């Protein structure tokens, strides 16, 4: 390979031999794209004029009144599409084009990645097919209509559990036979190399902007940047530019679901064990036998049974710290932001906010400048929350 597929012991390219050439060509295309000012100019123009970058950095005083915490929210909820997913989805599409490909293959659970894949493909003239498990299909009807509206072809999978992992399989089987003309658009900073690396690089503007912005508003770097961790893309995008700023804490929040002790959660980095699946060596939800399990969370966008390899690595060396947040804590954070700032955050993002509220509340006299990555908007969560309250 041209780049290191590993982050310590985590990462790699655990795919059948037939898929290696596909990964190798993609890696080489990425490296050339990364050094081409033309590609960069093109990516930037799209992010700026189409997606709406740079996103705002909102200081939320109402929520922190009476404490010594100063909180800022990186406004990815204001990005075209409703979430941070759009950034990388645009870079990958430009990459598929650099490779002379006209098709895009993807798969979804909560539907958000499918929508992002469809919007990018439709914008850049790519034929897009999306694999989604039936169980997810009939449950995420809005996003399904959304995808079709944007010309994407949504293909319902029924392999066993008929869900994400079963869709990923079909997407890969398809890709092995069509990689010559089709590009597999992975949804997060996980899977086989160069994916964790590519998704990070195409999301790193989150951290870069936040740094320039906080430096602008406060004249200093934050004390900590906090982000939710489903597969790891929004978190890594935020963390990336701050990794060499040793004074900046990097906090990743995994979903605690109904409570770690209950076993119903989506927190493999801290409460699971290493395995080899999804084409990578990384911590995962699995039985004692070695059978991968499902990650639970009130927020469907956080149900990845594993995590990105760079997160597993950053946590092994002490650089980044990962915590957990329950459905109730996320629900409370959700309600708090709506009532005090007029922003309906995505239940995924609410996990990140929930932790910062905990850091503030537990030690209200502690002076701390925090940045929460508000990864997406929660208009799609107004019903879920409604059914709870």
């Amino acid at each position: 390979t041209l780049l290191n597929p590993y982050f310590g012991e985590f990462g790699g390219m655990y795919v059948p031999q037939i898929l290696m050439p596909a990964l190798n060509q993609l890696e080489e295309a990425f490296v050339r794209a990364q050094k081409d000012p033309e590609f960069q100019a093109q990516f930037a123009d799209l992010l700026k004029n189409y997606a709406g970058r740079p996103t705002a950095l909102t200081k939320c005083q109402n929520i922190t009144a009476g404490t010594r915490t100063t909180l800022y929210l990186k406004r990815e909820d204001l990005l075209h599409g409703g979430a941070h997913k759009t950034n990388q989805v645009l870079g990958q599409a430009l990459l598929a084009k650099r490779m002379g490909k006209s098709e895009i293959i993807a798969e979804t659970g909560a539907g958000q990645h499918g929508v992002a894949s469809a919007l990018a493909s439709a914008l850049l003239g790519l034929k897009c097919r999306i694999y989604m498990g039936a169980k997810d299909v009939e449950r995420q009807s809005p996003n399904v209509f959304r995808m079709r509206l944007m010309g994407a072809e949504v293909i319902p999978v029924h392999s066993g559990s008929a869900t994400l992992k079963d869709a990923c399989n079909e997407a890969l089987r398809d890709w092995s036979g069509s990689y010559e003309t089709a590009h597999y658009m992975l949804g997060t900073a996980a899977g086989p190399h160069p994916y964790p690396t590519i998704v990070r690089e195409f999301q790193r503007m989150i951290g870069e902007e936040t740094k320039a912005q906080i430096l602008d508003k406060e004249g200093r770097l934050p004390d900590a940047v906090i982000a939710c961790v489903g597969g790891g893309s929004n978190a890594i995008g935020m963390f990336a530019d701050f990794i060499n700023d040793t004074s900046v804490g990097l906090i990743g929040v995994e979903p605690g679901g109904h409570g770690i002790e209950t076993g119903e959660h989506g927190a493999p980095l801290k409460h699971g064990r290493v395995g080899i699946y999804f084409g990578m060596k990384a911590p995962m939800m699995q039985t004692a036998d070695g059978q991968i399990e499902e990650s639970y969370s009130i927020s469907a966008g956080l149900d990845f049974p594993s995590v990105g390899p760079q997160h597993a690595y950053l946590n092994s060396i002490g650089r980044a710290d990962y915590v957990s947040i329950t459905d109730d804590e996320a629900l409370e954070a959700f309600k708090t932001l709506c009532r005090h700032e007029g922003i309906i955050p995505a239940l995924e993002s609410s996990h990140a906010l929930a932790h910062a509220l905990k850091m503030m509340r537990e030690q209200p006299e502690k002076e701390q400048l925090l940045v929460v990555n508000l990864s997406g908007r929660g208009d799609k969560d107004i019903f879920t929350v409604h059914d709870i309250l």
């Binding site: 992992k165 399989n169 080899i276 084409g279």
Partner: protein, 255 residues
């Protein structure tokens, strides 16, 4: 390891190719599975490629996926598989037994430990579906230490370097854009383990053709699982149909 060497030697003396059927351990149940396997051996299968049920066969098609589902519903666990493997070996001392595995189940409680159990039950080779030659170092070293043959897949989109790695890394047999004669001849040139054509072997004519191309034999994967899926309702007739299929495929390797 050795059982393969002796098999390919006996095959060459008989101037015939090997017919290797694939089947999922525990599909559609333990008792049914054991009986199917004996029928395959009785029918004339020269070796066997056995699959162990995994969460989701990361690199397997629908046919296999559906077979895994039946195995899961029947409550078949990898531990059960090893119990089945021991018994199969206890009944048949010389037939080579290869396992089709996924990395997690091998890595789960330790790679080395996995191969030690394989050696213990009498398994001859292991092909880890989602482990390409680039990530094979630990798996093949562990396999070698435990006298297990590390099988590698030589794809159609393989290149020369890949051909060379598979040749030096693999043992037992090579699981077979480019010309068939190209792969086979380059594999022999590189002293690769005997190549077994695994692509679309579903009819007798396929077996003869493979051997004709110079492949040491053929692996019929899904074909076997098909008969199983169809005759699921009448287990007695499932066996009867499996018997005939294997007999035909095997007869097609006798030159």
């Amino acid at each position: 390891m050795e059982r393969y060497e002796n098999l390919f030697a006996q095959l060459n003396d008989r101037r015939e190719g090997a017919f290797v059927p694939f089947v999922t351990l525990g599909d559609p149940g333990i008792e049914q599975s054991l009986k199917i396997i004996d029928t395959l051996i009785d029918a004339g299968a020269d070796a066997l490629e056995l699959g162990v049920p995994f969460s989701d066969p990361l690199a397997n098609g629908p046919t296999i996926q559906n077979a895994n589902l039946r195995a899961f519903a029947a409550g078949v666990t990898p531990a059960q598989c090893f119990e089945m493997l021991a018994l199969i070996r206890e009944k048949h001392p010389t037939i080579p037994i290869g396992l089709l595995m996924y990395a997690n189940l091998v890595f789960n409680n330790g790679i080395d430990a996995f191969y030690a159990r394989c050696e213990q039950v009498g398994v001859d080779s292991v092909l880890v579906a989602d482990v390409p030659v680039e990530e094979s170092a630990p798996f093949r070293q562990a396999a070698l230490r435990h006298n297990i043959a590390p099988i590698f897949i030589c794809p159609p989109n393989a290149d020369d370097d890949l051909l060379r790695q598979v040749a030096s890394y693999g043992r037992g047999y090579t699981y077979l854009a480019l010309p068939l004669h190209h792969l086979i001849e380059k594999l022999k040139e590189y002293h690769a383990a005997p190549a077994l054509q695994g692509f679309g072997i579903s009819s007798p004519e396929q077996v003869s053709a493979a051997v004709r191309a110079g492949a040491a034999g053929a692996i019929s994967g899904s074909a076997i699982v098909k008969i199983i899926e169809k005759n699921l309702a009448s287990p007695k007739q499932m066996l009867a149909e499996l018997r005939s299929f294997v007999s035909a495929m095997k007869a097609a390797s006798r030159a």
